[PDB]
Structure formats: C-alpha cells, structure tokens
Write a protein that binds this ligand. Structure first.
Ligand code: NI
Ligand code: NI
Lengths: 346, 331, 331
C-alpha cells in the first residue's frame, strides 16, 4: 500500500532502490526541471480514509484544503497547494541539517485535496472537518495546507472531537489577531479562528496563545478578546525585543501544559512581506527568512498534532520565493520533529 | 459613534482619500475649522527627476493602499479617525517648472497658515526644496528650523546638468535656507555609488553631518539616530521630516525610483519612528520617490503607509490622545 | 579628465557592456595593453542546468543594471572608471556542451595570460568547473590555489543522472584539482534540502570543511567567515572566488535558478566582501545561476551587481588606489 518510485519516473529507466530518494538521481534527472506527476515530497498518494492510512502505516498526512471562499479579504489561496507541491520537486526528502529522511521517517502520504462546495462555507467547512477526521482516526499527524484562514475552524473542531475528554492547545501565528466574535453576523469567517477554538469544550484560554501581531488591520474587539479572556499575545514587537527563541519556547510550554493535543495554525502573513509577497493581506514588520526557519525548528522540537499553513497566494508572486518558503516551513518542522523524536529513543 | 473601531455588526460610494479622510479644500480657514491635525496634499510632480519615471502615480497608489487599514492601531491604543483630512492634489501645468514650484510653495504656505501639519506625497524629491522653503518663510527669520531626511542619496549637487533645482540638488538648496542652521540638519542612509564626489566635498565644506548607512550600522543604528533627532528637535521652533524610501533595503521597498541594496529593515524604521515620536511633534512630513510601476504587491507603498500611519499613531500615543480601553463592541 | 566623478555638466550605436566598459577582444595582448585590472566575460551557457531555465539571459540583464551606476564610490573613495573592460560573450554552440566548455576554458586561460582578473558571469554553475580548471592549469603544479564559493547547495554530486560535469557536480570536480588542497577550499551558506546525503558523505570523505548557514548563524557569521578566508588566502598563490546568489535570503535574491529562504542579508554580504578585500587580491571572480525570469523588480541582479562592484571598490581601497582628495568639480 505504501510505495513510491524514487525520482518519480517509471517505464524503462525506472529507479528501484530502497533509499534512492535521498541520493542524487542515477538514471535521469527525476523531477528537478520538469514536474511530471509530482505529489507532495514525491510521497505516495493515499486517500483520506482511516483504513487506507492505517494500512499504509502513515504517520503524516499532507492534506490540502484550498477552500478560499470563507474569507473577508481576497480570493487566491486556492492556488497555493499546487505551487507548494511543484516547489517540493526542487528539494530532496532528506534534510542534511537534521540528518533525517523525512519521507521514510514519518511514512508521509499526500491525501490530495479536500473538495469544496463553491459559495457554501458551512458545507465546505464540514467537508474539511470530516477529511481531517479520517487522517487522525487513521493514526496520523496532519499537515494542512490552505486555503484561507477559515481553515483552523474545521481543523481545531476536528482535533477537538478526536481529543475527547482530553485537553487541547491552540497556537495562532499571524500579523492579524483573528478574534472577531462575528464578522457582519458570520461566526465562521477567516478572522474568527481564535474565538472558535475557545468555544470548543476541551480548548481552554490558558492553553491558547497568539504570536506575530503588528499594524492596524486589527479591530479593537480582536485585541479585546485576548484581554477579556486572559490569552497571551506576543506581538512582533515583543518577539524582536525579547528574542524569538525565548518567546517561542515560553508560549509552546504554555499551550502544551496539561494538554493532550496541540492545534497550530500559521498564517504566511506573519512573514515579512519582503519574504512572502504572495499573500492575501501581506504585511511589513514581520518574520525574516531565517526566523521563519527557526520558528519551524522550534515548533518541531515541541511538536503538534495539526500544523496548518494558510493564505499563500502564488498569483501575486512572480518568483518561486513564496512556494519554497512554504516548503521549508513544513520540512524544517518535520526535520526538527524527527530529530527531537530520535533523541528520545524512537 | 465608535463603530469603526470594531468588526462590522452587519445586518454612498466614497472617495480616493488618504485614510478614508474627509476632503477639505486647500484653504487656511476651512482647514482650521475642520478639526484635523494633518492635511494630506498630493504633488504628482515628476520634472526634477533625472532617473526612472513613475513617481507621479504615487499619490493615487499611496491613497489606495491606506484605504486597506483600520483607523485603530491596537499597539498604541490610538484611533486615527479624524486626525487627517485630504486636500487633494496640487494641479500642475506641463513643461512649466518655475510655475509648478510656485504652486507647490503656495499650497504649503496655505496649509501651514491653517496650523495643520502638511503630509506631502510626491512626486520627485525636488518638491522638498520648495516645501522646505515654504516652512522657512512661514516661521520667518527670527525662528529656527530643523530638517531631517532619510535617503540613500545625499542630493548635494550645487548644480546638476546646468540646473539648480533638480532632485540631486535638493540638499544643496535646502541647506542654504537662512533660518536653517546646518547643525539642525540630519541626513540618514547615504550609501552606494549614486553620490558623486562633489556632493561629499560640499557637505564637508558646509559641515553637513550626514549619517551614512555605514555610520549607522557601525553605531548599532539607534544611538546615532537619537543624537541626530536631538540636533534637529532641540532648540528649534519647527521641524521638517522627509523620506525617500530608498533609505530602506531593496527587498523592503522595490517600488521606489532608485532602489539600493544595504538599507534599513522595516523593523528598524518602525523603531526609528517611535524615537521621532518621543519629541511630540513635527511641522511638515514629506515622502518622495515612491514609484509604483516597479512595485511588487505594493510592497514599497505599503511600507510607506505603515511608516506614516505609525508615526501619526505614535505621536498621538505620546501626546496622551488615546482611546478609552474600556469601550467594547457590545456597546 | 575626471568629469565622471562629479555631477554631470550638461549641454552612434553603443554596446551593452559591464559598467559601460570599453569592449576589448578576448586577446592577451589587447587586454594587457588596455590598462584595466578586470575583464568581464559573459558565458550564457545553461546546458549543465538540472533546474528551471532562465540563466542564459543573466549576462545581458546583469550588464544592463550595471550601466545605471556611477563609477565613484564615496564609501571607499574609489573610482571604477577604466578598471574593467568587457570582452563580450564566449561564442559557444548549442547542443554540444563538450565544445562549449572547451571554449570557456580557452577564454579564461587567455584573460589569465593577460594578467587581468576575469569576472565570469553565467549561465549555470557548471561553468565554474572549467573556469577553475583554467586557473589550476594557469598556475601550474608548482603553485597552490585557494577556492571560496558562496551558495546554498554543496554541489558535491560525484555524478548526476550518470553525468559528471553538470551543475550539482561542480564542487566534486573542483575539489579534484591537483594543486587545490581541500584545506584551502571554503564553501559558505549551505542550507535546506537541495543537498542529498551523497553530497554530505563525499564532503566528509574528502574533508570539505563547509560552513553551513546554520554554522554561520550560530557563530554570528563573520567570526567563522574570517577563519575560512584565512584557510583560502593564507599560503596560496592564487584564489578563486565564486557566487551562486542563492546564498542570499530569498527576499534579496528571488531571481536565481534555485532561490532559498533563510540566507544572508545584503548588509551581511557587504561586510563579507570587505573582509575578503582585506587580503588584497583575487585571481578569478565568478557569479552563476542568476535567473531574470524569476526576479522581482531586478532585486537579485541588482544585489549581484552591487556586490561585484563593492568588491572591486573595496580591493582598490585596500591597495591604496584611491582618488586625490584635493580634486574638485569646476576645474
Ligand atoms: Ni489570519
Ligand atoms: Ni492574517
């Protein structure tokens, strides 16, 4: 059930070789110039089904959620997943910085895309919950690739249900606070990730945190939410003042303390516009390139159950910089997770 | 009403104005009456520019970018609603430079008469010559002016291509203003090769104490900026603050008429903005040489907007002009 | 006459050349006579490229950006006028790499014969294999060569697709040159996952002491760079310096064959350039894998240009080859 061809290509010059995927390609160029039929990481395709995932023995599911009609700003995040997948052909699944083969370590699979019902945010969000559910119930941790920032509403909801009587942490990294109680009467748009997590029966204010805030696309009520509910906000200001590693470790401890699971949503507009022009609402005064990698590394050491990444818009990026940045967000999280796991006898 | 501070509750197509400001004519009496602290004036004038074209579209793009932000700035607990008005644009002829400048002059004098702070959006950098002259004349010979400008180019050409009021001459003119002592002048960010030897020679001759980008990095930036803020604001009656965003690193501000590697990061400029705000006021704010045809995702225009609006927010915070913390949406 | 040092005074078909250099044919006698220290050599060869296409246009796009810059660098008190010439592009056939490489080889040998420093602009990274071989042969087995390359990729494929001279093989071939001791080899900036396990294995096997980007960040960058500069320049007769500008953060270098997030920022590479220049010479300067179709408002090409020109300026300052302070404009 769990197989892939190293360097993609079958036919006469197929490569066979248990480990060929972590080494220079031997018979041909693989997909480094031409994409062909690339999955995320060249991983096996596996339907988002608990049985199929289980029998493959997959511990990470890449699942795209391109839904971009749950949001208040501008469409475009629907195109991100394709550019992320394409960008992975520009890397090997082996990461020398961590000495791990990500692909075999996690038995990662690509669960394709969650389908959408254009115009219907309610039904599309339900599909997301259900697709995520299959991944968890199959015994895997999930990488969710958006799609607009409505994604954590179904994402957290799904992990909330799977966690049961246990407790769940919620980390939200973003230049925007995302705590509208409603937007023009709507409870489930892309700017209500945090209040909707707090509503989940097993998600508690003391295990919730926000990082990345700056600038004036942040109504007072979004700030008020964190004040009134005693939820830690670490502004970009504080992360620069006090240091990324200091602030990250502190809030990863907070959101994991006496929790069974952790939901981590990461908006690419947390990244400085200089590094990520391809975004729904890009913002200056954000994470630098090296700091994005560092945060991914730190996130990896602590670990989460679902990591989601939202709002990448490749149309507003004429280069490869956005897509490759989003590849590294994921690959550094997995490389760091694996190294941390291996330093504990696993 | 304070509904604008908060998410819309739900249940007249407006205008291209700085910050969704009201329009108010370029008239001292109307301006004093309106109750705002700042008056935005566009100046799509391009004819001092010896380099790549595009700055005349900056005022439109700058306005548009500003529309995208709420007026509320949670970091400062400040609301910018009503603090500014937009006077629209100084109408220019063409192939008519002398008259163009005269019109800019009149526009700035008028705004200054009102007691409001002009925010002047170019257009090329030469517009700073005549905006600075206007402040000079406004305050008169018995008062003291300070000048601070951010940019990669000194612009200290005594003359350029036989002319005297092109953008590369701008500092050579401004430092000749009679009530502007060279000791109250700062220039921050100069670097790279768009700085011919005579600009250096003249600067030394006049004792222009510019803070090159090398000097800034070597000092850890902020301590040297602080001393130059001091020289410009201590014992002056009025201060002019100008920005060419090629002070910033290219990556941070591509959409400028002459980008330059090796400049300020956005977070450095935001710290600098707060340091300027500590002094609790400014007389004229200019930004020149935005060039949106060369901008990617409006990165430069976006950054300019953040810088200008944070400066407004920061001045208001230090002035105590905050909003009520206690106020909530369910009111 | 020194009119180019100063603001311009005012009052036939060209070529596009590095820095508006004179053209000088690829001839040792002509090059020796022309009086320049550097010869720009374009190499629009992309047939060792395993990645996305576009590098073939880099030499033209690089030259164009350089035409914009004045030749005087106030930060160094140096003028670059006359310091370089452009030898045009190596004439190479399509679909015959073996012959193309032979012609690159010969062109580089020729410039080295002239005593001038070749500045070689790719094109793909594999052109460095044969430019380095040219230097190796040019100094002969009596001499010791040093090699320093900046990039995000080790390029230590013994073979790639059964081939041996493609871009990701470049380092595997260069470190087999007989008069280049591995201890005199530096490689700075390797990061992210375009670095398969065999590249690491071979590196260990041969004792390539590469400075990964993580190593560099951990050390504050410059302390570790200085160590590797010393290994390359101390006790060597000639030094090869090469740049894939994916060493740089994506933000400052989008327009490259294979961008990489989390790399050097512009001011950091500038500092590094001055650290290199303190050693008072280089034998060959290469830059490969610029890729204009991916660039954002010329950002990568503009950074490359500013890096190459500051290196020139910085080397001149170290050699005392500065401009007379007493020189003035209206002479
Ligand atoms: Ni968001
Ligand atoms: Ni956001």
């Amino acid at each position: 059930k769990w197989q892939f061809t190293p360097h993609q290509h079958r036919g006469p010059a197929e490569q066979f070789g248990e480990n060929d995927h972590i080494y220079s390609p031997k018979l041909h160029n693989g997909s480094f110039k031409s994409r062909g039929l690339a999955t995320f990481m060249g991983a096996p395709y596996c339907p988002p089904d608990r049985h199929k995932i289980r029998e493959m023995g997959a511990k990470i599911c890449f699942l795209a959620v391109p839904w971009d009609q749950g949001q208040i700003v501008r469409a475009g995040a629907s195109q991100g997943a394709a550019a992320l997948r394409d960008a992975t052909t520009q890397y090997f699944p082996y990461m020398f910085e961590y000495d791990v083969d990500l692909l075999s370590f996690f038995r990662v699979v690509d669960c394709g895309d969650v389908p959408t019902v254009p115009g219907n945010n309610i039904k599309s969000q339900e599909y997301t919950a259900d697709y995520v559910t299959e991944c968890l119930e199959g015994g895997a941790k999930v990488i969710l690739f958006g799609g607009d920032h409505s994604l954590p509403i179904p994402g957290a909801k799904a992990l909330s249900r799977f966690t049961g009587s246990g407790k769940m942490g919620y980390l939200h990294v973003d230049c925007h606070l995302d705590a509208a109680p409603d937007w023009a009467g709507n409870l489930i748009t892309n700017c209500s990730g945090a209040p909707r997590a707090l509503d989940l029966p097993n998600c508690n204010a003391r295990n919730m945190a926000h990082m990345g805030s700056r600038n004036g696309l942040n109504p007072k009520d979004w700030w008020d939410f964190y004040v009134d509910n005693e939820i830690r906000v670490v502004t970009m200001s504080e992360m620069i003042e006090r240091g990324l590693e200091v602030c990250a470790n502190e809030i990863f401890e907070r959101v994991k303390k006496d929790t069974d699971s952790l939901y981590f949503t990461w908006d690419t507009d947390s990244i400085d516009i200089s590094c990520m022009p391809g975004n729904s609402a890009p913002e200056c005064y954000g994470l630098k390139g090296r700091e994005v990698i560092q945060l991914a590394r730190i996130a990896g050491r602590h670990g989460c159950d679902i990591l989601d990444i939202v709002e990448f818009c490749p149309y507003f990026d004429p280069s490869q910089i956005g897509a490759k940045m989003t590849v590294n967000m994921i690959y550094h999280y997995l490389g760091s997770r694996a190294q941390t796991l291996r330093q504990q006898g696993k | 009403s304070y509904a604008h501070l908060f998410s819309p509750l739900g249940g007249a197509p407006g205008l291209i104005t700085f910050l969704r400001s009201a329009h108010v004519p370029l008239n001292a009496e109307a301006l004093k009456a309106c109750g705002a602290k700042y008056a935005f004036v566009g100046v799509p004038f391009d004819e001092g520019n010896i380099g790549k074209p595009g700055s005349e579209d900056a005022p439109r793009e700058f306005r548009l970018i500003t529309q995208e932000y709420f007026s509320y700035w949670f970091e400062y607990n400040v609301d910018l609603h009503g603090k500014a008005v937009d006077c629209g644009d100084v109408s220019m002829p063409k192939v008519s430079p002398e008259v163009a400048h005269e019109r800019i002059y009149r526009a700035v004098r008028e705004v200054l008469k009102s007691g409001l702070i002009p925010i002047i959006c170019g257009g090329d950098r030469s517009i700073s010559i005549t905006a600075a002259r206007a402040l000079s004349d406004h305050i008169g010979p018995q008062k003291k002016m300070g000048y601070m400008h951010f940019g990669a180019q000194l612009d200290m050409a005594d003359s350029w291509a036989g002319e005297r009021n092109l953008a590369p001459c701008a500092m050579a003119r401004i430092t000749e203003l009679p009530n502007l002592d060279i000791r109250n002048v700062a220039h921050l960010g100069a670097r790279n090769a768009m700085n011919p030897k005579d600009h250096i020679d003249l600067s030394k001759e006049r004792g222009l104490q510019y803070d090159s980008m090398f000097d800034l990095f070597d000092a850890g930036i902020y301590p040297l900026v602080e001393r130059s803020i001091d020289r410009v604001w201590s014992g002056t009656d009025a201060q002019y603050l100008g920005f060419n965003f090629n002070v910033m690193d290219s990556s941070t501000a591509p959409g400028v008429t002459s980008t330059e590697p090796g400049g300020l990061e956005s977070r450095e400029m935001m710290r600098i903005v707060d340091m300027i705000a500590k002094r609790g006021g400014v007389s004229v704010i200019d930004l020149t040489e935005l060039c949106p045809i060369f901008d990617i995702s409006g990165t430069a225009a976006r950054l300019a907007a953040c810088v200008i609006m944070r400066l407004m927010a920061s001045l208001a915070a230090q002035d105590g002009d905050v909003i009520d913390d206690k106020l909530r949406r369910t009111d």
